[PDB]
């Protein structure tokens, strides 16, 4: 089977700049006629593969003309000569030579747009879930860069090291931004015997931590 | 454009046929490749079947040992993947890709197949709001979407939309212990489409379980 090797495996490139993506074949794609049987796709966030060169250089249906693929044989590069927030995704190279059509590991293309703070919002049990047995406190940040961000729940002031999960969404293809869903999930007799619930988040575009809180029935 | 459907929740060892169909031009004159995507992963190639000019000759992933069949219904426009003694392994967002015959290297919206043996399980949701002050002029609120099986396919909308308004969606994550997942959806809207004493509605459809309709007050 051909083997396709993408490199680098992740950028994070400035509006305006160029950005290249390079992709290296175990065998040579050169066909009789000329042209190379080596295709680029890319993969938005949310949505399914699309086409943006095929044949080594040729710029598929409304594709920008910032988008280039180069390369003969074993060595493609793809080229974005100044890259923008919607550029965001998974860029794939794919050989069509022989079955199996092979494709390479995937090289996630950030947009490094400038610090953005996050908006932090704290949301309590609602006694619907109290009901139940378990309650479950919803720390939400909203459309910040860079990713990096770190969330930490204290209990009456104490820190917690388990009992939390996250996700982060996808860099938003407009704003390029990120945003985070932090859910610390106790059980209803724990959720009682304390009194003060907060998430605490450190990133970059904030001062210092910033802390949402609240006193559980206080509301 | 092409629609795909077909898959779902399958216990190893299952069956499932899957469908792409063309809707608005015919698919007798192009190749159907099928590729699949497990979640947060690059892409594989299972198997393809050729036009009914090249007598419909299939061709499939070697590691797929003889389980797959790439078939095609020229008078219901449709090619199908069929999947016996379905794997765990097997769990991925399946695509049908388009060859040839235009619109040619075009890819589907992709069917979700989840091999497990663990039980579906419906999401506990609940209305979220804020202890604290409203943003000025905009309220937040939101709905946890608490212990649910399979992660996907699952969707949240709200009774509320328009200008000013913005749905926050999460990807699910796991949770500490089991096999269940959480996430949650939020909605800022302006305060004037949230008066106080009115109610919004979260609409969650999880997998084929019935959908479920949570009230959520205004500030």
């Known amino acids: 089977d051909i083997v396709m090797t993408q490199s680098p495996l992740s950028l994070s490139v400035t509006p305006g700049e160029p950005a290249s993506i390079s992709c290296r074949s175990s065998?040579?794609?050169?066909?009789?006629?000329?042209?190379?049987?080596l295709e680029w796709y890319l993969q938005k966030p949310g949505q399914s593969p699309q086409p943006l060169i095929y044949?080594?250089?040729t710029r598929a249906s409304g594709v920008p003309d910032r988008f280039s693929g180069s390369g003969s044989g074993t060595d493609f590069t793809l080229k974005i000569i100044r890259v923008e927030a919607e550029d965001a995704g998974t860029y794939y190279c794919?050989?069509?030579?022989?079955?199996?059509?092979?494709f390479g590991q995937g090289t996630r293309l950030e947009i490094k747009r400038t610090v953005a703070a996050p908006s932090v919002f704290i949301f309590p049990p609602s006694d619907e879930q109290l009901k139940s047995g378990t309650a479950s406190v919803v720390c939400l940040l909203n459309n910040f860069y860079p990713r990096e961000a770190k969330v930490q729940w204290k209990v009456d002031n104490a820190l917690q090291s388990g009992n939390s999960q996250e996700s982060v969404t996808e860099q938003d293809s407009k704003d390029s931004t990120y945003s985070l869903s932090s859910t610390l999930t106790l059980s209803k007799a724990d959720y009682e015997k304390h009194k003060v619930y907060a998430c605490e988040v450190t990133h970059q575009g904030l001062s210092s931590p910033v802390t949402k809180s609240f006193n559980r029935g206080e509301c | 454009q092409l629609v795909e459907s077909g898959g779902g929740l399958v216990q190893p060892g299952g069956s499932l046929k899957l469908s792409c169909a063309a809707s608005?031009?015919?698919?007798?004159?192009?190749?159907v490749h099928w590729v699949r995507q497990a979640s947060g992963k690059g892409l594989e190639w299972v198997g393809r079947?050729?036009?009914?000019?090249?007598?419909?000759?299939?061709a499939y992933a070697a590691s797929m040992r003889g389980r797959l069949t790439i078939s095609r219904d020229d008078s219901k426009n449709t090619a199908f993947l069929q999947m016996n003694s379905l794997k765990s392994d097997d769990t991925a967002m399946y695509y049908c890709?388009?060859?040839?015959?235009?619109?040619?290297?075009?890819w589907g919206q992709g069917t979700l197949v989840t091999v497990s043996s663990a039980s579906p399980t419906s999401p506990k949701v609940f209305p979220l709001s804020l202890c604290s002050t409203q943003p000025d002029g905009n309220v937040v609120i939101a709905c946890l979407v608490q212990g649910f099986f399979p992660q996907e396919p699952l969707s949240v909308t709200w009774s509320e939309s328009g200008q000013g308004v913005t749905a926050r969606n999460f990807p699910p994550s796991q949770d500490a212990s089991g096999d269940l997942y959480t996430t949650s959806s939020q909605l800022t809207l302006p305060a004037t489409q949230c008066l106080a004493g009115k109610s919004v509605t979260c609409h969650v459809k999880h997998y084929t379980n019935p959908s479920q309709d949570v009230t959520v007050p205004c500030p």
């Open positions: 794919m050989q069509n030579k022989q079955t199996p059509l092979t």
């Open positions: 608005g031009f015919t698919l007798s004159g192009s190749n």
């Open positions: 044949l080594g250089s």
């Open positions: 890709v388009i060859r040839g015959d235009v619109y040619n290297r075009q």
């Open positions: 065998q040579s794609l050169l066909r009789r006629d000329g042209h190379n049987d």
């Open positions: 079947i050729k036009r009914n000019a090249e007598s419909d000759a299939t």
